[PDB]
């Protein structure tokens, strides 16, 4: 309404609309800041699955949501 704050949640900088950026659940991350909480890969280009405050790629998601005694 009054103003808008779409700054990066990773570094804190100010994400401008005139550049490749990301926005999920309301937050905003830089195309270089938005990474995966599993392999630390830049999902700013590759697909992924937004989980509990955690961004996991196709695999990082299907793997964590997979049934198995796997310790890690
Ligand atoms: Zn950033
Ligand atoms: Zn990943």
From Swiss-Prot:
Interacts with SOX15; the interaction recruits FHL3 to FOXK1 promoters where it acts as a transcriptional coactivator of FOXK1. The chain holds residues 101 to 159 of 280 of the full protein. It comes from Homo sapiens (Human). Expressed only in skeletal muscle. Residues 8-60 form the LIM zinc-binding domain. It is found in: Nucleus; Cytoplasm. Recruited by SOX15 to FOXK1 promoters where it acts as a transcriptional coactivator of FOXK1. It comes from the Eukaryota. This is Four and a half LIM domains protein 3. The modification N6-acetyllysine is found at residue 64.
């Amino acid at each position: 309404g009054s103003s808008g704050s779409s700054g990066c949640s990773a570094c804190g900088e100010t994400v401008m609309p005139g550049s490749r950026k990301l926005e999920y659940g309301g937050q905003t991350w830089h195309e270089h800041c938005f990474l995966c909480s599993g392999c630390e890969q830049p999902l700013g280009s590759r697909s992924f699955v937004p989980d509990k405050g955690a961004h996991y790629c196709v695999p990082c998601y299907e793997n964590k949501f997979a049934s198995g005694p796997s310790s890690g």
